[PDB]
Amino acid sequence: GFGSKSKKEKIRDGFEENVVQVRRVTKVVKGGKHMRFRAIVVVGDKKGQVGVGVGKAKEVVSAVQKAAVDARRNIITVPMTKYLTFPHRNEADYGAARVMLRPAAPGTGVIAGGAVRTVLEMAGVENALGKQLGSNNALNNARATIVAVQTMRQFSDVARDRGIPMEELWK
Amino acid sequence: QKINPLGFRLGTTQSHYSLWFSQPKNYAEGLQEDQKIRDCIKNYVQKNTKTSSGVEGIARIEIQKRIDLIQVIIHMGFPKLLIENRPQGVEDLKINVQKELNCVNRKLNIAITRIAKPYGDPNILAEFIAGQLKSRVSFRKAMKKAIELTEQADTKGIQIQIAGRIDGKEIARIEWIREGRVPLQTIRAKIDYCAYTVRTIYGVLGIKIWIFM
Amino acid sequence: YWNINLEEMMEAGVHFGHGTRKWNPRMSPYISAKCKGIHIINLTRTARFLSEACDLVFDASSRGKQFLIVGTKNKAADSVARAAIRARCHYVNKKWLGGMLTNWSTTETRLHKFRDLRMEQTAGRLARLPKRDAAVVKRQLSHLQTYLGGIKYMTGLPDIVIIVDQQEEYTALRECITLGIPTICLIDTNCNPDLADISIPANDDAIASIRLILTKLVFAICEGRSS
Amino acid sequence: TRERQKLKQLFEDAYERCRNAPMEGKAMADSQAQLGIGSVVTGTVQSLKPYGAFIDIGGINGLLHVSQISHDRVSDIATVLQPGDTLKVMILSHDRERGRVSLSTKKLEPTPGDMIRNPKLVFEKAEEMAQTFRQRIAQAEAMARADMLRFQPE
RNA sequence: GUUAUCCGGAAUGAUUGGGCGUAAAGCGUCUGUAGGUGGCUUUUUAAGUCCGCCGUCAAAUCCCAGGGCUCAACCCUGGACAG
RNA sequence: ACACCAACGGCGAAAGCACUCUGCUGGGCCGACACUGACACUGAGAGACGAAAGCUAGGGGAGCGAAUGGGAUUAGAUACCCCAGUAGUCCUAGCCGUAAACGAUGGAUACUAGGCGCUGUGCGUAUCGACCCGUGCAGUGUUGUAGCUAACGCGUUAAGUAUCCC
RNA sequence: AGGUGGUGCAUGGCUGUCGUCAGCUCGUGCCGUAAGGUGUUGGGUUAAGUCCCGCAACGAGCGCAACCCUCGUGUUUAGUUGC
């Protein structure tokens, strides 16, 4: 109880935050019908470092930052080899949200649906195109991209895994 | 519904204010005198500081009658804001308070004291959230602002209830936030509360502040 | 170096495994033989993984850390405490709480209260209050004495946690896997080598096999402090 | 900084968990007697029942099992059996239900042996281990105090 | 701007690209004709398949590169992958 | 019509099938190389069978029992309750071809942890004979890893991974 | 100016009620994709979510109880206008 949380908020230049949806989810009780706020926060620096997080609380801002503290303990790093794009195409479903990611030329800003585009514009990739096949959901969507960019391999570690010395690569 | 703390704890840990001991017809007339003194002081400082800038926050007006002489103590938090600098503030208070007590021409000493920490005194803090909330500022920014504004100034537990018609609504609500222990039932516990009514433009608001010290 | 001769384990209760129709078959490229309703653990890969175990324990203390050992079984209850008073490590007495590693903020405040109650227990003001307050302080001090009596000397997380075999402490183990804290533990004949990331598969029916591997790692840690 | 240190630790361990998976290589009275779990003495059989033999062992209750008794090639007796006999028993499972101790002869146990390199160095450190063991075992006194000043963890 | 018509979005007719326990959906089960798919080795022809070359698929359109209208639209010259 | 036997049991492609015995006859499973050498799978349209109720023809008719009739409850009762009770129920020869005909899961092959079971056979142990242990398969069941699934759950008899056919 | 004119479904304050019933939530952690659960459930025991044991829960706030008044017994002190 020292006060004002100035040093303790950690001013968040390192991780920039945004919501991607704040739906009010509600439960009914004996007394009636009371609601809490479920916010989904995607945290990440533009270095290649993102992760989702849900939260719910009766306040809006405590749900956002509570989802952020859930989010900033959930980070993967993005395998993004070239001039801020992707090594190869990928698809990976989670639940019932399927996400096709596809690398792009460098003259192409990120084009995807709002959750996928949110976790990629926070991922610092600049050149991708990801269609979403399946759900209208936002959480399983974004988390499906996170699973869809964990399982993604560069050329250096595939060259290391196969044992092949090196060729067949322009750069 | 719930009993209010300053009523509930009167035998112990909370003392009365209008501290003069009398007989029935003289009790009614002494209560006349008390109410007109609190009227003249409240309306006085409200006028002569409404022209001035900020809020004053007069918490307690204790009135005591030892002899035919009336000690009046005024417990505001910001007492330098009042006076016209030689002492002429309290002098003109003493003029207008002498205007409505001179049945028996008995002397009265209007004093003024400092609140120890003005954020921790619920009438003053309730006046702050009243003032900011009467300006166009949301419930959340102003109310959390009152909370951290309080906990920087050393308060054990706090409860804030703001009543209906918050920023733009036609359905009344109640919104209360609590931190720490506020045991309203513990008789020893010494909770001081205030219940200020904010007179806004699109309605009336009600602020009720409990402070556990 | 940290060797153990093959015959010292091969004589005692190390290959003296567990039940022959309870085996969890991720030991199917591991377990050597089966005899008389009891499994027979492969001792070559056992001692090699113990070589690796003492390499990665003595190296981790050579960096300079503090290690943790869980003790809960009541078949190996006090043997861990003997294996933790001399070895300077902080330890679980008899029983575990779900949350002593991951929810360690409330456990930390619970150590504020436990530290203050030990300060009141030592100070001799315990006999001031009558049997009510002394009864309450003895009860909560008894419960924190059950858990937090053996880990008073810890702030923060360890580096390597070594646990009572597999069964009773999947809770503490899964808190370690959530925290990422590497653990090197004991495996029965019917458990997972993939829960922790290196562990030491040997039966713990023998108290002397438990005293063997634990005593081995106790001298590994103490020689880690030897600097 | 602390989180980064933790991550580095985890990496170290995963690599330490990356180098060498590759390569390398009647009963109620007995129940009343069990007020306290401690103290082995020479195992006393005080009931006998196919599945095993039930055995008082210095104040602790044990269970020998048939497969863990001596094999019997002798003419007459019931296998498992034991009546009031007093038998040297080694400490095995220590049954968790009711807090017992299990006991096991365990057999001939011949195991195939694979030769291990550095035994020249490997015997020497085994000797060093035995020396440390001889230095170990300490029966009485409790460390502690070391005095110091106690401070808040914060 | 509204409307109408068409495609997209629509993986909402699905080869790329869906489903069938309970959401729409497995015949009540079985025999079997036509038809569909089909074990292994060795040999032969090459119908499919692949490679080379050649002919043609008008011109205009689309794509690339030049050129002309003050630029563009449009016009013009040459070239070609597909298939 | 077939009590106890009756079992989370056996068989059939499904529907179904149980008092016993006999006759004719289908199908399954297992072994030896004893034989042929891909003869295989699925199956449009087609054909067969297909609980119960229904109908044609003739028997038969104890119990039960739509409709019906009476009594009761009920404001009322065409209904639940009760008493009679016809078609029907059973059989012969057909027709009808529908059912929650359900495992709410078309079929076939190959591959992918285990535990606890049951049924049928086969080998070895043990005795030399019934046991009893492991097993080789096929089938049936229950918890369950991986994986799948919106979830519940399914999980070597997949709702898993793939291929084919309707 | 005055309004005991309207709207208590624009409000504040105040109050009743379920009911002095024993609950209602929160922080951190865990589980579920998620709404959510877990705590607060289970074994006893209470007037009580009162307390004790086991438990992926650990703690905490409001609740209950106590501290508040009065009537109960006694001691010390003071005796008038009271004995």
Q: Which two tokens stand for residue C123?
A: 């100070």
3-state secondary structure chain C: CCCCCHHHHHHCCCCCCCECCCCCHHHCCCCCEEECCEEECCHHHHHHHHHHHHHHHHHHHHHCCCCEEECCCCCCHHHHHHHHHCCCCEECCCCCCCCCCCCHHHHHHHHHHHHHHHHHHHCCCCCCCCHHHHHHHHHHHHHHHHHCCCCCCCCCCCCCEEECCCCCCHHHHHHHHHHCCCECCEECCCCCCCCCCCCEECCCCCHHHHHHHHHHHHHHHHHHHCC
Residues 23-42 of C with CB under 7 A from strand F: 23-25, 28
Residue in chain D closest to C64 (alpha carbons) equals: D9
Domains of chain B in start order, with CATH, are 15-116 (no CATH), 117-213 (3.30.1140.32)
Which residue type is seen at B24? P
Structural domains counted in chain C: 2
Is C90 found in the same domain as C36?
A: yes
Domain-embedded: residue C181: yes
Stretch(es) of chain A classified as CATH 3.30.230.10: 78-171
Domain-embedded: residue C17: no
Domain range enclosing C125: 97-148
> What CATH number has the domain bearing residue C103?
1.10.287.610
The distance (Å) linking the CA of C25 with the C1' of F20 is 52
Is C164 found in the same domain as C90?
A: yes
Domain-embedded: residue C11: no
Is C209 found in the same domain as C113?
A: no
Is C219 found in the same domain as C180?
A: yes
Decide: CB of C194 under 7 A of nucleic strand F: no
- Rounded Cα distance between C204 and C162, Å, is 14
- Rounded Cα distance between A146 and A140, Å, is 10
Which of C148, C182, C215 marks a domain boundary?
A: C148
- Strand G bases within 7 angstroms of protein beta carbons: 10-17, 24-31, 33-37, 52-69
Is C118 found in the same domain as C171?
A: no
Resolution of the coordinates, Å: 3.4
Inter-chain touch A4–B140, beta carbons under 8 Å: no
Resolved by = cryo-EM
Residues near C2 by beta carbon (within 8 Å), at least 6 away in sequence: C51, C54, C55, C58, C216, C220, D125, D129
Is C62 found in the same domain as C34?
A: yes
Which of C148, C177, C212 marks a domain boundary?
A: C148
Alpha helices in B5-64 (DSSP H): 5-8, 24-50
- Rounded Cα distance between B30 and D46, Å, is 95
Is C137 found in the same domain as C115?
A: yes
- Rounded Cα distance between A109 and B8, Å, is 67
Inter-chain touch B140–A61, beta carbons under 8 Å: yes
Q: Which two tokens stand for residue B150?
A: 């309080």
Q: Which residues on chain A are in Cβ contact (under 8 Å) with B140?
A: 59, 61
Tell me how far CA of residue C99 lies from CA of A103, B155, C105, in angstroms.
43, 32, 9
Residue D144 CA to chain centroid, in angstroms? 28
Element (H, E) at D56: strand D52-57
Inter-chain touch A3–B151, beta carbons under 8 Å: yes
| Closest C-alpha to A84, from A111, A123, A30 | A123
**Nearest-10 crossing angle of helices B88-98, B24-50:** 140
Is C206 found in the same domain as C174?
A: yes
Decide: CB of A98 under 7 A of nucleic strand E: yes
Domain-embedded: residue C12: no
The distance (Å) linking the CA of C47 with the C1' of F113 is 26
> What CATH number has the domain bearing residue C178?
3.40.50.10490
- Dihedral sign of CA atoms A8, A13, A19, A20 in order: negative
In this structure, CATH architecture of domain A78-171: 2-Layer Sandwich (3.30)
Is C211 found in the same domain as C130?
A: no
Taking a C-beta distance cutoff of 8 angstroms, is the pair A113, A37 a contact?
A: no
Is C142 found in the same domain as C56?
A: no
| Closest C-alpha to B208, from B122, B136, B137, B138 | B122
Residue D1: CB atoms within 10 A of its CB come to 5
Domain-embedded: residue C37: yes
Which of C128, C148, C168 marks a domain boundary?
A: C148
**Nearest-10 crossing angle of helices C43-63, D2-16:** 150
Residue C115: CB atoms within 10 A of its CB come to 16
Domain-embedded: residue C56: yes
Domain-embedded: residue C6: no
Which residue type is seen at C172? A
Q: Which residues on chain B are in Cβ contact (under 8 Å) with A9?
A: none
